[PDB]
Amino acid sequence: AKKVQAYVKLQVAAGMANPSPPVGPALGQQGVNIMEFCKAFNAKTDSIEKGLPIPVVITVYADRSFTFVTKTPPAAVLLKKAAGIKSGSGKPNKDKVGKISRAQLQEIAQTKAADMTGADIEAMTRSIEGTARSMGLVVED
Template sequence: MNRCALFRARPDTVCVDVGSSRRLPPALFKKYKDTFGVAREPHRRVVANFRYFMRPGKAMTGPPLGQDLSKVGIKPMDFCKVFNDKTKAVFKDDVELILRIQIYEDKTYSWRIEPPPGAWYILRCCRKKRRETNSSTWVCFITLEMLFEIAKQKMRHWAKPDEPEIEIRVRHLIGQARAMGICVLGVDGPSSPVWGMSEREYEKKSEEYRKIHREQFFEEQRRTLMEAPLYQRLHHPDLTGLTPEEIQKGLRDPKLFRSLWTATDPKSLHSVERENEEMAVRYMRSKKWALHKEVPKEELVAMYKNRDLPPGYTESLLKSKGPAKV
């Protein structure tokens, strides 16, 4: 594929500015969350789970949707009407949504829609259709920045947009693109994906792009740490940024004292000896030694400590002889 064809394959909506945000714009994120996010349901026994690929406004009472819903006592016509009314005015007709339906024991159900699968986004970026890719050879190219834009929309939990991190989601998309025979420029190929820019110029711009993204990543990690409760920041040496109100609030947290007790409680000699005895008994039983007769625990501990010594030697004997002469 020549560079000109690759340049035409780049969507206009992809943000290629240096230091672009790691998340969706606030307005778009709110729209996505209202559309795909669902409230936590109370705990009820689930009897069936269904998953379909459905286009907006295209739900029909025929199989497989209508057949599966009829088996569990749900009217397919009512569900199709609700689904079509909700999705037809929001999405385009060619979007492949993921529909999940959960059936409960009391004949009630809940359903939610999810963004299209990652393969759908990748094929749209490459201007390819299904069965036009081949895993045995490269058939087209995709840029790393496109995968970052796709990863922003493929969130696992809309209430926690940074879990998992965007780098982990991009790695999954890279593996999926490779399995489809799509070369990821910047990972699998060093060529410049921008028309009119040399490879060295593109590498210089990419380094600047990665530098700003690393700064954003560390800033996000620092902000997350500073917003965490006080008992989770005990391992962090810098607590000077805390205000007196935050310190007082953290001191009133019962988990703080439990964490301090766990971190500062020294083990007594009795507990250490008991752990050694238990470890020795488990080891001797795993080797099936001294099981035919009653052996004191002190002797078991001595045998466990001397398990790596040469035959006929004991730990006290070696100490009395001192180091071996060369």
């Protein structure tokens, strides 16, 4: 991934391909061939989860050489995964949705902490914990 002239952060849908009213010309204004991106990403969908708002970090080079950097889905949508309650903020502090624990959430935090940018893996889960009541969730303790 090069510097920012065509550098974007994208991928509303991971399990769904080419969401043109979500993304469409969000990178098509930069004009990158996303047809080489998707079937490559279908070969990047060999191992992990499906049908989820998983983001991406895309920068291309000068001569159509393309590059994606995907990560784990955001901590605001990590609450909908390990808990099974696909809702969020709206107005979160008086929105009651549900509650799972630090010991339930940490199973998918066993993988993503190296995928995230930190050295404290006990505190990169706290990037979901303070996100939780910012998306209307409680944490079991």
